[PDB]
Amino acid sequence: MIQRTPKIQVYSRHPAENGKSNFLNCYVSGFHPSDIEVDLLKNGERIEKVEHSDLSFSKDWSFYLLYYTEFTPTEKDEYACRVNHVTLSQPKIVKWDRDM
Amino acid sequence: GSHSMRYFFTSVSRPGRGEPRFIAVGYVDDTQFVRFDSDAASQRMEPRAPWIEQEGPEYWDGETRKVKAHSQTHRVDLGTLRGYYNQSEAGSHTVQRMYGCDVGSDWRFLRGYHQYAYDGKDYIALKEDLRSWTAADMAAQTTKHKWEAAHVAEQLRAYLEGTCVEWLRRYLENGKETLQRTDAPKTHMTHHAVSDHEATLRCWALSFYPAEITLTWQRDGEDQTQDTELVETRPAGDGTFQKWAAVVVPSGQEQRYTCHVQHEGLPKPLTLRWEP
Amino acid sequence: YLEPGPVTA
């Protein structure tokens, strides 16, 4: 009853290049309890087609999941991960920052 | 390299109606190979690696039977533990179980483990000798006595030392093409100018397997931990992993800093330096 | 290969 907030990374499976098919990932970890809602956003709109890994957890018992969807990046499309969990009073939104 | 087989079980009670949501995943090292989800339609243990599809319908039958036995133990435990903790029926609760075995480079038994948690905290765990138990509180103490009189540790010891390692070795053989392959990290460094006097160097490691890796920075050949940021290792989604480590540096002094990468797949560590 | 059958707590 320790609740733990999720850490969130947003990134691509492969090095990101315009016009090349890829996968946009949202990796959510360190959270408890397990119920969580993760949306991947494209220019602020929910992407419908999102899959996720099978729930597992770390040695400290905190959960992690990977949400992912196929995409072809372009120069002007902005992407983001939107996460809600009991520990958060509103949705947390992390932008995909390719150029790190 | 050492290897490990590990199973992870989560049950989450559903107060209004019905049995708990149950999810089970099996790993060999960092590779998911099986799953069961009480919400999926098949109601069978399902393959998640190509090399486990070699196993015959008797394996699948046996794994499905066992995994539903696990689900039923957790369903019961959620009820028992609720009562032990004097909790109402209104709240969702969670039980998590993890067990498995590690073997060394010779593939001989190294370590086994079997741990259980209620609502995200330690409940009970098998000790290292696999002969007795660590109970975190008095509820768990009651469980420990039950499992002692029922010689549970002995049955688990037989499995963790015997069967677990035996099937791990089978899996390592059958999945050898991927499971006995190490993928060294693919590295590079980027540079980002914060202000006129401050720059960030990020040392990236992509596409490595297994997940275990060390990235560290040095300045003029000694370790540097201040002004560094190291993200959690993360799955690429294609079975490999990614990580990076960043250091902030005074603009112009980039050349003093070196990122060092260690990994099972790199015969010696690798050093990266900005130039680039 | 799963263990045969967890014992209830």
Author numbering:
A (entry chain B): 0 to 99
B (entry chain A): 1 to 276
C (entry chain C): 1 to 9
From the paper:
subsequently eluted from HLA-A*0201 molecules on melanoma cells. context of HLA-A*0201, present in 49% of Caucasian individuals. important tumor antigen, targeted by many clinical therapies.
unligated structures of A2-YLE, A2-YLE-3A, and A2-YLE-5A. addition, the P9 residue was an Ala in the native sequence.
